[PDB]
Write a structure and sequence with these properties.
Elements: E1 3-8, E2 11-15, E3 23-24, E4 29-33, H1 41-46, E5 50-52, H2 71-81, E6 89-92, H3 99-110, E7 114-118, H4 121-130, E8 143-144, E9 160-163, H5 173-176, E10 191-195, H6 206-210, E11 216-221, H7 234-237, E12 241-244
Parallel strand pairs: 1-5, 6-11, 6-12, 7-9, 7-10, 8-9, 10-11
Antiparallel strand pairs: 1-2, 2-4, 3-4
Helix pairs in contact: 2-3
The chain binds one DNA strand of 72 nucleotides through loops.
PDB class: transcription
Keywords: transcription, tfiih, tfiib
Entry title: the P-lobe of RNA polymerase II pre-initiation complex
Amino acid sequence: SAVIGGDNEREEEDDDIDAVHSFEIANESVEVVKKRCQEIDYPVLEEYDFRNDHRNPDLDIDLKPSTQIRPYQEKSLSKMFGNGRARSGIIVLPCGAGKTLVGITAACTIKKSVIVLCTSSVSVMQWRQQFLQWCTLQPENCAVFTSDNKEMFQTESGLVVSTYSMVANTRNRSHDSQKVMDFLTGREWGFIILDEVHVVPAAMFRRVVSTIAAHAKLGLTATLVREDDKIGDLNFLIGPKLYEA
DNA sequence: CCCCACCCCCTTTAGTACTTATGCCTGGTTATAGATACATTGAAACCCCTTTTATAGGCGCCTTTTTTTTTT
């Protein structure tokens, strides 16, 4: 019959298509970590029919802010555009560079429910303000999902902003990872933005990505490489540096 | 040479107690406006001056006379 997919606890069950992913011996079903949901894009451009039981995106309005981009910023964005993950991957730029502008552009371009993963709450507030262009921070179009408050909303530069996570009963999206597709989490959001992606390689934080169906992934950072060389894992989950300056 | 254990770090956020400024309201005396004590210069309002010719009471005030009381 028609192809179908569904999300189960940070994994994607698959039916009617052997080609798309990998088969599970234990239970005859194609199963994959949530991160490899993107192969579904194969059906998209193709306009191949499938049923998407897996993704539960928060409803997202088609954003149309106007974001001006200097030339280098456009170049990086375009590199990112090629795969929006393999090509998006991570963008490395100096602090002055205006990576956030690129992020904003991707969010506008993508216009899907988005999750931003940041280290601190302050950065979260900062991002939240920028998100205002799509709809002001006061606007519903922006939300914050953390221990303090849990709001699950759509698109923006990232409609949802959350932190990497901490250790506690309640924490950031890492804790939440099964619950809602983010850079961190399960099946709510299509785009995952990692501000300061270098943090992501933490053994725990990395799960945020794996557990995520979110096809598009962007990591922003001044310095990609880690002393630990943990940075290597990013390519699979997030992507490798498609652009650097 | 490899594996396991111990030591040192930074991560940022949540708690209630303690200190400082703002608003609160509250007890003197000082600064304002007008009238009072009153005192001012101004004026009007007042009685005052010239006399007569007759009538006939009451009015007050004078010096000389008579009576009473005191002292020797």
